[PDB]
Amino acid sequence: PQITLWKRPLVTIKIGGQLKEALLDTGADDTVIEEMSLPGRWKPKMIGGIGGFIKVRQYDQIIIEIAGHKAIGTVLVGPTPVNVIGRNLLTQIGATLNF
Amino acid sequence: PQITLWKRPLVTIKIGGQLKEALLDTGADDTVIEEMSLPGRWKPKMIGGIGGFIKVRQYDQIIIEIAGHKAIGTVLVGPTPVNVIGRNLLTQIGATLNF
Ligand SMILES: CC(C)(C)NC(=O)[C@@H]1C[C@@H]2CCCC[C@@H]2CN1C[C@@H](O)[C@H](Cc1ccccc1)NC(=O)[C@H](CC(N)=O)NC(=O)c1ccc2ccccc2n1
Ligand SMILES: [Cl-]
Ligand SMILES: [Cl-]
Ligand SMILES: [Cl-]
Ligand code: NA
Ligand code: NA
């Protein structure tokens, strides 16, 4: 699709058999999702956003569908008011910004 | 242009007479620029994201040239580590996400 930006670019994602809404975010290096169980071990990570840094749980090689496109990659889990799909997975679904 | 997302989507902007680099950020509602003076009236605002909130100055009707394309709108000025071009101005240059 071609998504305009008059509204937030929110799409459905599927992770763990569950549907969630998430933001397609060209400004995010990483993908950050609300607290949720994921399989396997996690590693520590600090990420910085507009208000400061937070600690998150880094899970690698997680299967996630994004707007019907399959990705398998790193998902950070931590406190965020919005689930964010960052460039690590936007590249896997072939997303570009155009004007 | 078509901008791939392997790297941060940084472009040159001109604002307040000044050339700067900024991030094309589909996950930002607002345009947030590093501390600088702008002409006219402003009012305080709090904006948030991961990590919490910051206090900003809101200037309305500010012109910014973004990768050669003029846009006008509200620009927030405050303690951001990165200049962010958010949706309020990305719409004005006709930017879309495509996959
Ligand atoms: C996700 C993460 C990997 C941590 N990356 C980032 O956060 C980088 C950090 C960079 C340096 C600091 C300044 C911002 C830039 C760009 N951001 C990406 C950037 O796209 C970031 C992603 C985001 C969206 C929504 C909610 C939280 C987080 N957007 C934002 O921070 C913008 C700022 C704004 N305009 O007010 N926030 C929002 O647009 C926004 C939307 C809904 C909300 C609901 C409740 C609470 C807060 C909400 N904030
Ligand atoms: Cl990844
Ligand atoms: Cl505006
Ligand atoms: Cl349009
Ligand atoms: Na894993
Ligand atoms: Na003004």
Picking from B86, B76, B74, B72, the residue whose alpha carbon sits closest to that of residue B53 is: B76
The whole-angstrom separation of Cα B4 and Cα B1 is 10
Give the experimental resolution in Å: 1.2
DSSP state string for A11-59: EEEEETTEEEEEEE-TT-SS-EE-S---SS--EEEEEEETTEEEEEEEE
Task: State whether residue A63 sits within 8 Å of chain B by CB.
Answer: no
Handedness of CA B88, B90, B92, B94 (dihedral sign): negative
Handedness of CA B26, B28, B30, B36 (dihedral sign): negative
Task: State whether residue B47 sits within 8 Å of chain A by CB.
Answer: yes
Q: From edge to edge, which strands make up the β-sheet containing B2-3?
A: A2-3, B96-98, A96-98, B2-3
Picking from A95, B96, A1, the residue whose alpha carbon sits closest to that of residue A31 is: A95
Q: How was this structure determined?
A: X-ray
Picking from B90, B70, B56, the residue whose alpha carbon sits closest to that of residue A97 is: B90
Picking from A50, A23, A12, the residue whose alpha carbon sits closest to that of residue B23 is: A50
Domains in chain A with CATH codes: 1-99 (2.40.70.10)
Closest partner CB to B48 (pick from A24, A50, A94): A50
The whole-angstrom separation of Cα B24 and Cα A78 is 24
Q: Which residue of A has its CA nearest to B55?
A: A51
Burial degree of B96 (CB within 10 A; 0-12, 13-18, 19+): middle
Q: Which of A34, A50, A56 to mutate to test the pocket of ligand 1 (most atoms within 8 A of CB)?
A: A50
Burial degree of A24 (CB within 10 A; 0-12, 13-18, 19+): buried
Is the CB of A8 less than 8 angstroms away from the CB of B96?
Answer: no
